Amino acid sequence: RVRSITLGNSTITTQECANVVVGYGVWPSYLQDNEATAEDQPTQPDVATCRFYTLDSIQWQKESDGWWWKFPEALKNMGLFGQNMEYHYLGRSGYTIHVQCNASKFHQGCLLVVCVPEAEMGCSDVEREVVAASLSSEDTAKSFSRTESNGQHTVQTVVYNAGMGVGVGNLTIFPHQWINLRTNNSATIVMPYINSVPMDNMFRHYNFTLMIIPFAKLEYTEQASNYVPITVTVAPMCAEYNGLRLA
Amino acid sequence: MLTPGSNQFLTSDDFQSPSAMPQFDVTPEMKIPGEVHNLMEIAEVDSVVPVNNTKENINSMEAYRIPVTGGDQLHTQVFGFQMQPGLNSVFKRTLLGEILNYYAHWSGSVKLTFVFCGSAMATGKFLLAYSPPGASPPQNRKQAMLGTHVIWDVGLQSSCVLCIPWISQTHYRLVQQDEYTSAGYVTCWYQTGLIVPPGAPPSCTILCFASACNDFSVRNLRDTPFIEQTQLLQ
Amino acid sequence: MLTPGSNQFLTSDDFQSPSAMPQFDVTPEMKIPGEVHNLMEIAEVDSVVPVNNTKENINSMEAYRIPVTGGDQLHTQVFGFQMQPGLNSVFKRTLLGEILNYYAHWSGSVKLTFVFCGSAMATGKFLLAYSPPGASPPQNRKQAMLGTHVIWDVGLQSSCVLCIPWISQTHYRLVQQDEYTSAGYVTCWYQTGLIVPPGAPPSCTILCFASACNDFSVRNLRDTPFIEQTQLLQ
Amino acid sequence: YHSRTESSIENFLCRAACVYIATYASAGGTPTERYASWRINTRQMVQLRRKFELFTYLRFDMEITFVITSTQDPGTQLAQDMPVLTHQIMYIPPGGPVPNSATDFAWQSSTNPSIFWTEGCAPARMSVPFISIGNAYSNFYDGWSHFTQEGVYGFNSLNNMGHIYVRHVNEQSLGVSTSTLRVYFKPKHVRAWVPRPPRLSPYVKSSNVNFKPTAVTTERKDINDVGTLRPVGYTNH
Amino acid sequence: YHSRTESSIENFLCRAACVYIATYASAGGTPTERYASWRINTRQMVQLRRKFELFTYLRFDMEITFVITSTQDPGTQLAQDMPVLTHQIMYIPPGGPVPNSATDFAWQSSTNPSIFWTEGCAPARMSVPFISIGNAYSNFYDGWSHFTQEGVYGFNSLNNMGHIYVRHVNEQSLGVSTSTLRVYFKPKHVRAWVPRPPRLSPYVKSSNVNFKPTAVTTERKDINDVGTLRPVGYTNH
Amino acid sequence: YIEASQSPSSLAVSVGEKVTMSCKSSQSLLYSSNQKNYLAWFQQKPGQSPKLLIYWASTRESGVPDRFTGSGSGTDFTLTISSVKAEDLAVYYCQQYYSYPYTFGGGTKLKIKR
């Protein structure tokens, strides 16, 4: 029934038998000798990068709308991964996203968890431009909004347009999963490295965006927990960085 | 030696042309995941359908949620619509309809999935009725039962699939066609009520997904009507 | 039959052309020694580097001589510079830099040789420290020791080779790039003093040579910035 | 079970489209009126933009055809008999010199391929290969230009295609000769990756992805309101 | 371990360069204004000179393309309708007769290949083989013309390439028709020997190697002065 | 060590006259990547804690009256007051916060002329 996973020898996690979605059909892997536009052979840190990094839990309530995290920025302050981000210049890594809810049999709702590659976002004032502080915090979820935003340098946050200007109903085209509290309680997404160049800077490029959006609102009875906690866990897979030594 | 069509520029011609930049070596291609070989792959993906677009919900997230009320609904209709992607207001903005809108001719079979977002302790039944192109929508539950129907129990099962077929006189339908009441109807009826124990919410939601089946054909590519302005940006 | 690019003159085209002087027999070629097959051969040659260009020595031969003073220098720095050929004032006028300046993109590893021009009776040590692209130059001897360093003894050995490698995020650097403090630094420190017997001179000189290693790549040929005038001579 | 060959990427994206219409004079005037310039991009024609932004990455060759039509200009001192008009079309690769005026030195640069075309013949055509540093063009780029997380947002320097500049070769002493240029653009050997949902809101800026909030669909009368109805008749009795 | 194919002699020296721009009239005037002349050499364009003087000996074939553009001339008695303009381009090998005026006899010599070109067509091209007595061209020659150790210093007679002369074939009775010539020069099948250090001082003379003393490099602040520095920040704490 | 030199003497002018001062820095104080000038003009009431006037040489500190305007780009750095006051007696420094160490200025007393 239950299964335990031990990555990095320092992290323990528990899961039940559930369907897993492997990205675009491919599995994360190291860089072969076929593709390269550089010289120094990449160093391959795996002792500490490959471990479960559990982010803070969030509260799903009746009037909540959704959240998004920008990756790889979400792991800027997360242990040795942040140190490798700071010390090196080029980088490549795939991820494994676990999302778990904790709701009884008396709650109800329906969530969509997607992984949008290159999710460029618009601005509230169509004339101005966004800034780096409004796009994403370090490791804190950025909330969507029910109504129209009116800031100057703030990302438009109407939920049904998803900030990208497209219908929210068609987001299923990307790697995704449905968490229906009636049947399911967890989701797993394995995302490889997707870009037009083999390596890129971690602080410059946002590889992708993780969005959690409820389509069916949360409902319950008076004598019940007012919220449902959502826990997100990330474990980098097949990380690479450039070389710092002379040829 | 020189035919009449010798020295013209036909915009849909395919001839080789001199290379502006010979002696230039392009960058070899890498293996980026997710290559697209056909637009049909974009159409065989389930996308949530805004059934509940009643002019108070078009500018809200309530468009997608089909409301199922408890209480005591005798035999009232839950929802109903017409099967015409690309032209019906319900389907024209989903992935399937927006792919179909690019092509003047199209044909195939459409797959529908219904999912019950409700408490794990809720029990009930619904009747899903489908009427052929030449008929009329059922007016009450008994007429719907006597046609083509399926009884869906939300206690035993959570999702119900229904593959609307394609029976047409020709072999290609058109987006710009005036063929109302000739496209087929799908309705849902209250076979019984929604029964819940003390502590569960009395009302639930149904979500509807629509997508492509194995067989489709598209012909005569043309400009979409969704974009309006012909002005150039800046 | 006639494509749009049929009757134009593209200056970078390679087509055969009629011979102005047929029936003319050219002189057969002889075996002249020293044929060049690539410009990289001009870059893999050691050339003296003007490290000491302090605005009093640019118009003199003192540019090339790195001064090593005797007396008692505790731990002071002998010299130091940044590893950016083609753009740094030190390297842009040597053979390597002047070949690299012709190409918009380039990459590889750079080889440095240090030679001690001093009396055969002089003894001492130096510390050669190299810092990676993202770091800061060492401020004192202890910080330089804790990094990447080599201790060079001028009593046992006369010349010291040091091959600065290439670790970069992309695969091609640019001559016209604003990437200061991101190129790497090389410094030399007084590990001990210079010790001489009675009769030898107390001060010496170091000569520095810089050249190409086995691996380089160059791309996108372009005009050099060293020549300025666009006027025609006479 | 009918054919799908018309929905392939090649048959869907290889349709020639008019992407620029400009005009320029052949005689005295403001210098900027004596040549025509265009920076190659796919973000100014909304109909072509909506087609290219179904995919995240693209890789294709460019085929460009120029249709040039000239006419006489009203005024005084009309030309009684002119031999022929010749036009110069120059493609500037990314990083090449770009003219700031007609009769400049950049017009005679050896690194810029040029076409000299005389009135009366077939339209001039050229083909540019996949000219880029990376391994694909990217329609959507989430990131910055500099690593300081500041600069222009959404701009990538890996998808520059150059410029096109057109002028009159002839020097005209009698009268003016206005000319009109139309540019027809076509992708070839197209490869696309990572499909995306098509846009819903109207475009507001060529450089940005900014938008106004728009309703997800068209309104309907009621949830159980099927489209219209039919009156009683001979079949319905 | 990336490619070096772009640094080869062929890919380095076979770029077409504009090496001459001249003009000439088609009607009455000073005779020297009615034709255009150029002695073929590589010592007048400093950018091409700096590239050829990396090697001591060279051996290549010449490809020459002529771009000719004509316009009407203001004045009185303008031509109302002219049929077409034809141009004559003549290459004179070393030692052949050289015109001293237009409408001369040397224009009709049978030893001088000529091209007759009409307005409207593609630019005219010719190719000259390695035409010399020796076995190579020499960019640098240390010696004299005569054996008396006197004469012109630095001149070699083994690297003559001829002349190019252009004129108007037509005889014009109504008006003047000024024309402009541009010459594009390209080496092919290049072979080079004995590499040399590239020049540091600016050029002063096309015939000489004379120079002014120039500093060996650009000045620096101090011997241990690394380039600039960075302020304290979040990384540097 | 990086230091900066203030004017040779104090203001030594009348009350109510606009004063212009400059601070000569011994090295560049502009970071070309951010186009930021790391220097500020300070003010210390005798006996109390100091307090600057304008930081970054282009952004006046909140709560500071509109009389003080700091300028200067690159090595030079200036400041102007359109109304000098007798109750603003202090010691004016031009402190730099570019790199270690955070060296102060030279000092400028507001003397008496009345």
The single residue listed with the structure tokens 């400041």 is F79
Are B175 and B108 in contact by the 8 Å Cβ rule? The answer is no
Q: Where are the alpha helices (DSSP H) in chain A?
A: 79-87, 132-135
Taking CB atoms and an 8 Å cutoff, what residues of chain E touch C53? 216-220
Report CB contact under 8 Å: D173, E71. Answer: yes
Count A/C contacts: CB-CB distance under 8 Å: 55
B34 touches chain A (CB under 8 A): yes
The single residue listed with the structure tokens 């006479």 is C234
Give the Cα separation of E23 and E6 in Å (integer). Answer: 36
Give the Cα separation of A239 and D211 in Å (integer). Answer: 36
Read off the DSSP letter of residue B178: -
* Residue ranges of domains in chain F, CATH in brackets: 4-109 (2.60.40.10)
Report CB contact under 8 Å: B18, C1. Answer: no
E127 touches chain C (CB under 8 A): yes
Q: Is the dihedral of CA D226, D228, D232, D235 positive or negative?
A: negative
DSSP F30-68: EETTTTEE--EE--B-TTS-B--SEETTTEEPTT--TTE
Amino acid at the residue B14 = D
Q: Is the dihedral of CA E228, E234, F1, F5 positive or negative?
A: positive
F26 touches chain E (CB under 8 A): no
What phi and psi, each to the nearest 5 degrees, are found at residue E46?
-65, -35
Q: Give bridge partners of residue C180 from the DSSP assignment.
A: none
* Right CATH for A2-241 from 2.60.120.20, 2.60.40.1930, 1.10.287.110, 3.30.230.10: 2.60.120.20
Are D34 and D168 in contact by the 8 Å Cβ rule? The answer is yes
Number of domains in chain E: 1
What is the residue extent of each domain of chain A?
2-241
Amino acid at the residue C66 = I
For A219, how many CA atoms within 13 A lie in the half-sphere containing its CB? 18
- Whose CA is closest to D111, among E182, C5, E14? E14
What distance in Å separates residue D120's CA from the closest CA in chain C? 12
Taking CB atoms and an 8 Å cutoff, what residues of chain F touch E230? 31, 99
- Based on its alpha-carbon atoms, the radius of gyration of chain E, rounded to whole angstroms, reads 24
D89 touches chain C (CB under 8 A): yes
Instruction: Tell me how far CA of residue C48 lies from CA of C114, C128, C207, in angstroms.
Output: 10, 18, 7
Give the Cα separation of D167 and E183 in Å (integer). Answer: 20
Give the Cα separation of F96 and F109 in Å (integer). Answer: 19
Region of E228 please: left (phi>0), alpha (psi -120 to 50) or beta: left
Cis? peptide before D83, omega within 30° of 0: no
Which chains neighbour C (Cβ–Cβ under 8 Å, 3 or more pairs)?
A, B, D, E
Q: Mapping DSSP to helix (H, G, I), strand (E, B) and coil, where does residue B149 land? A: strand
For F78, how many CA atoms within 13 A lie in the half-sphere containing its CB? 8
Give the Cα separation of B141 and B186 in Å (integer). Answer: 13
For D160, how many CA atoms within 13 A lie in the half-sphere containing its CB? 12
Give the Cα separation of E95 and E131 in Å (integer). Answer: 12
Are D54 and D195 in contact by the 8 Å Cβ rule? The answer is yes
Region of C4 please: left (phi>0), alpha (psi -120 to 50) or beta: alpha
Kind of pairing between the strands at A186-191 and A21-22 = parallel
Q: Is chain B touching chain C, with at least 3 CB–CB pairs below 8 Å? A: yes
- Return the structure tokens found at C16: 């055969």
Cis? peptide before F101, omega within 30° of 0: yes
Report CB contact under 8 Å: C5, D124. Answer: yes
Angle at C49 between CA C192 and CA F27, to 5 degrees: 75
User: b/e for C73-83, b at 16 or more Cβ within 10 A?
Assistant: eeeebbbbbbb
Are D132 and D120 in contact by the 8 Å Cβ rule? The answer is no
- Return the structure tokens found at C161: 């080779």
Taking CB atoms and an 8 Å cutoff, what residues of chain F touch D146? 33
Q: Mapping DSSP to helix (H, G, I), strand (E, B) and coil, where does residue A138 land? A: coil
Give the Cα separation of C184 and C133 in Å (integer). Answer: 4
Give the Cα separation of F53 and E193 in Å (integer). Answer: 69
Other Cβ atoms closer than 10 A to C16: 9
From the list C20, C26, C41, the residue facing E130 with the nearest CB is C26
Technique used by the depositors: cryo-EM
- Return the structure tokens found at B81: 């619509």
For C106, how many CA atoms within 13 A lie in the half-sphere containing its CB? 27
- Return the structure tokens found at D108: 């005679």
- Return the structure tokens found at E235: 């990384």
Report CB contact under 8 Å: D116, C4. Answer: no
Q: What share of chain F is helix, strand, coil (3-state, %, to 5)?
A: 0, 30, 70
Amino acid at the residue A61 = Q
- Whose CA is closest to E81, among D129, D54, D79? D79
User: b/e for B90-109, b at 16 or more Cβ within 10 A?
Assistant: bbbbbbbbbbbbbbebbbbe
Which chains neighbour A (Cβ–Cβ under 8 Å, 3 or more pairs)?
B, C, D, E
**A63, closest residue in chain B (CA to CA):** B61
Report CB contact under 8 Å: B16, C2. Answer: no
Are D159 and D132 in contact by the 8 Å Cβ rule? The answer is yes
Report CB contact under 8 Å: C165, A247. Answer: yes
Best to test chain F binding among E228, E234, E235 (most F CBs inside 10 Å)? E228
C178 touches chain D (CB under 8 A): no
Report CB contact under 8 Å: C10, D122. Answer: no
- Whose CA is closest to A49, among A89, A93, A12, A14? A93
Q: What range defines the domain where residue E5 resides?
A: 1-237
- Whose CA is closest to E163, among E65, E39, E23, E36? E39
Other Cβ atoms closer than 10 A to F68: 19
Give the Cα separation of B118 and A108 in Å (integer). Answer: 5
**C220, closest residue in chain D (CA to CA):** D95
The secondary element (H helix, E strand) that includes residue E50 is helix E46-52
What distance in Å separates residue B16's CA from the closest CA in chain C? 7
Angle at A164 between CA A163 and CA A169, to 5 degrees: 90
Other Cβ atoms closer than 10 A to F107: 13
Give the Cα separation of B7 and C1 in Å (integer). Answer: 8
Give the Cα separation of A97 and A188 in Å (integer). Answer: 6
Q: Give bridge partners of residue E187 from the DSSP assignment.
A: E62
From the list C169, C170, C213, the residue facing A247 with the nearest CB is C213
